[PDB]
Amino acid sequence: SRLYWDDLKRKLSEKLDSTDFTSTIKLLNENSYVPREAGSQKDENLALYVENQFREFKLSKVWRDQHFVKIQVKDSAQNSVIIVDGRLVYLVENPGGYVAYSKAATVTGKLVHANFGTKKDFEDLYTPVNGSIVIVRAGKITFAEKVANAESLNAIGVLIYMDQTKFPIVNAELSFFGHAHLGTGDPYTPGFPSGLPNIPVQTISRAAAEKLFGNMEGDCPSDWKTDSTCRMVTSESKNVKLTVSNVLKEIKILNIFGVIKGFVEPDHYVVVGAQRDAWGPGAAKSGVGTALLLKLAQMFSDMVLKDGFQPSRSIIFASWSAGDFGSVGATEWLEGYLSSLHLKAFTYINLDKAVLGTSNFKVSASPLLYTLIEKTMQNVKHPVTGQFLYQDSNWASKVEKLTLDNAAFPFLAYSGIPAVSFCFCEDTDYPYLGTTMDTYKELIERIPELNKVARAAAEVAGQFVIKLTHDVELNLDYERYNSQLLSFVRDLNQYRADIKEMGLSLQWLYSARGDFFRATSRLTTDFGNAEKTDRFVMKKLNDRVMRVEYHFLSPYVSPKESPFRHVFWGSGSHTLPALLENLKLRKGAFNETLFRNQLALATWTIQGAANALSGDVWD
Amino acid sequence: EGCASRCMKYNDELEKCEARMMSDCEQELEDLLYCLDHCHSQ
Ligand SMILES: *[C@@H]1O[C@H](CO)[C@@H](O)[C@H](O)[C@H]1NC(C)=O
Numbered sequence: 001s002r003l004y005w006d007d008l009k010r011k012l013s014e015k016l017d018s019t020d021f022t023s024t025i026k027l028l029n030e031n032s033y034v035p036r037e038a039g040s041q042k043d044e045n046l047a048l049y050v051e052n053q054f055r056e057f058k059l060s061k062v063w064r065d066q067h068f069v070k071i072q073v074k075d076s077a078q079n080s081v082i083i084v085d086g087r088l089v090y091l092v093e094n095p096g097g098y099v100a101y102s103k104a105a106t107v108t109g110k111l112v113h114a115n116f117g118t119k120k121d122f123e124d125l126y127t128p129v130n131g132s133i134v135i136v137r138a139g140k141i142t143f144a145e146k147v148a149n150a151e152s153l154n155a156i157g158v159l160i161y162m163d164q165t166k167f168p169i170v171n172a173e174l175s176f177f178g179h180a181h182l183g184t185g186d187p188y189t190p191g192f193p194s195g196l197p198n199i200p201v202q203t204i205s206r207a208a209a210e211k212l213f214g215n216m217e218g219d220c221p222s223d224w225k226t227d228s229t230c231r232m233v234t235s236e237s238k239n240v241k242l243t244v245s246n247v248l249k250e251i252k253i254l255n256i257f258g259v260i261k262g263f264v265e266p267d268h269y270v271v272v273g274a275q276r277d278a279w280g281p282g283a284a285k286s287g288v289g290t291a292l293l294l295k296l297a298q299m300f301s302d303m304v305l306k307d308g309f310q311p312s313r314s315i316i317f318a319s320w321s322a323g324d325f326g327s328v329g330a331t332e333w334l335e336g337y338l339s340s341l342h343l344k345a346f347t348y349i350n351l352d353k354a355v356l357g358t359s360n361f362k363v364s365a366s367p368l369l370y371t372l373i374e375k376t377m378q379n380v381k382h383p384v385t386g387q388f389l390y391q392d393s394n395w396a397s398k399v400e401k402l403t404l405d406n407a408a409f410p411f412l413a414y415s416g417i418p419a420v421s422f423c424f425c426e427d428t429d430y431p432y433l434g435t436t437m438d439t440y441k442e443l444i445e446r447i448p449e450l451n452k453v454a455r456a457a458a459e460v461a462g463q464f465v466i467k468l469t470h471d472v473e474l475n476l477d478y479e480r481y482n483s484q485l486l487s488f489v490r491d492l493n494q495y496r497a498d499i500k501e502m503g504l505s506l507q508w509l510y511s512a513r514g515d516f517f518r519a520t521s522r523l524t525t526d527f528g529n530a531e532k533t534d535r536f537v538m539k540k541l542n543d544r545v546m547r548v549e550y551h552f553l554s555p556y557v558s559p560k561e562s563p564f565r566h567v568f569w570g571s572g573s574h575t576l577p578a579l580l581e582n583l584k585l586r587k588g589a590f591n592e593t594l595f596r597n598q599l600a601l602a603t604w605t606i607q608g609a610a611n612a613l614s615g616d617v618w619d
Numbered sequence: 620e621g622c623a624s625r626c627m628k629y630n631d632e633l634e635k636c637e638a639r640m641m642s643d644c645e646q647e648l649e650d651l652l653y654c655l656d657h658c659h660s661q
């Protein structure tokens with residue numbers, strides 16, 4: 001009997017009901033696999049464990065992908081934070097954590113609080129930060145962005161801590177880790193035998209921060225909603241000395257892969273991935289994802305070998321290393337297939353940090369995946385309330401774009417592959433990420449129904465996979481870009497009068513929007529008319545749909561200078577938001593020459609994406 | 620029918636209005652955008 005969606009959905013649900021996710025999470029907190037910094041013996045032990053599991057599940061093929069990359073680690077000299085009061089000097093902390101890609105340096109000066117280190121946070125301070133060290137709270141934005149924002153204003157170093165209000169942790173002495181590269185991948189290693197900080201940056205404990213605040217004056221504003229102990233600026237008699245001595249080290253990292261080959265179009269794949277490495281025990285950070293990855297591979301393999309599931313397209317499971325350093329393992333893999341990966345991999349599903357709580361279900365993705373997400377929400381229940389996830393029909397207008405710290409980001413913004421990340425979470429951040437308290441014990445105490453929540457995260461990802469691989473057609477919603485383009489043109493249209501003043505016209509941009517619109521309609525019509533059983537018609541149409549995301553990567557910038565080339569979701573002067581940010585200044589921070597080029601290049605990119613949607617040259 | 624075909628009449632009205640305006644189209648845009656964002660293809 002040929003299986004249909006209803007049969008597959010009910011089979012998945014059946015297998016999930018008997019799956020024990022918590023045993024696997026707990027096994028990854030055993031002493032043989034913690035802590036597991038990238039390139040460590042323990043990371044490697046876990047890789048080889050994952051490999052041998054994939055083999056046990058009888059995946060079609062299992063393989064290793066190795067890279068040598070340069071990371072930064074702690075030196076043998078301790079990093080330190082010291083109060084200089086001249087007549088006396090005393091140690092505040094030798095911190096147990098560090099920030100990777102810090103400049104190694106020693107600096108001394110005033111200490112100034114900048115809240116979270118957002119651009120607006122700095123703008124609202126009464127104290128200029130130039131020539132000073134800045135202290136900020138973790139959260140809201142990445143460490144890399146905090147450091148970049150501080151550097152932009154000529155700060156000389158950055159301290160980062162977890163305040164009790166946002167991060168209610170009983171232990172005030174807890175250390176933590178992150179990285180400050182404003183990018184992904186290995187920023188160091190040349191092309192023979194970059195978003196990096198030029199100032200030192202260091203994580204300190206809350207206790208350390210509180211000792212600093214005891215040498216500081218001024219209450220913090222109440223709208224910061226932070227602890228009552230917070231203070232704003234060092235006293236005139238005191239300065240802070242920060243010493244960072246981190247060193248570079250070459251490591252070998254292993255990405256572990258397994259595939260279930262498609263029955264019809266094995267050369268096209270959905271890729272499902274999870275970070276394996278972590279500073280410290282990494283239960284929520286890496287354990288949960290890796291457990292999901294293992295259980296999904298096992299279940300899908302069983303569905304194919306025992307239950308008659310015949311996926312049309314391939315399913316790849318990827319266990320990545322050096323995720324903690326900026327998706328380094330995944331980025332290195334992407335970079336090997338510059339310009340061609342999008343012809344093979346048609347979607348990426350990230351599993352990292354999929355279970356951080358119970359209250360909310362959040363999703364970030366390429367618009368191409370929005371219909372798939374919507375249909376999946378209609379068919380998965382919330383693991384505590386029992387209600388289906390689809391309770392807001394206007395959800396798609398609220399989604400936030402993927403960020404630089406999410407492993408799905410480079411797949412979309414660098415490689416042009418539609419990608420999705422999702423989680424069950426709270427409003428508050430999970431407090432133990434990047435610490436030695438990120439353990440199975442803490443995770444099960446905070447989420448005692450962890451097994452049912454993991455089951456729901458598995459069901460989401462499992463349903464994505466089935467939808468993407470089952471039918472002869474691709475469930476990718478290219479028409480979703482009509483709303484994204486129109487929304488942009490709406491934002492641009494606020495500056496119509498500026499545009500007239502400069503002697504320019506939007507006619508060709510309008511016209512390119514209209515061309516893309518009609519071109520998506522025609523492609524939809526063609527799918528509607530195609531003989532669904534003709535493997536040759538369908539492979540041609542599906543090949544076309546797989547190039548839609550890639551054609552929003554600007555062809556006018558080097559991926560070595562600006563890796564995130566996607567004009568909607570990427571970063572730099574070629575993006576559509578950057579065009580609007582410049583034009584916003586014209587009311588001489590505004591650059592008219594840049595704007596002219598930006599309008600031209602955007603228009604060419606959108607028009608070229610419309611043309612690319614036509615089948616043959618004579619159409 | 621897909622969303623682009625369902626909403627085609629509104630796309631045409633916007634283009635017709637842009638064409639007039641080049642010899643404010645905010646409503647014609649708002650209408651299209653509304654139709655696109657409230658359309659569920661599946
Ligand atoms: C910050 O810049 C101002 C203005 O140029 C300068 O006078 C001051 O010395 C600088 N502050 C420090 C602490 O370097």
Ligand SMILES: *[C@@H]1O[C@H](CO)[C@@H](O)[C@H](O)[C@H]1NC(C)=O
Nearest residue numbers: 588590591592593594595597
């Ligand atoms: C304005 O942009 C153009 C083109 O990118 C560039 O050559 C020029 O340096 C920019 N001018 C300023 C003042 O930044």
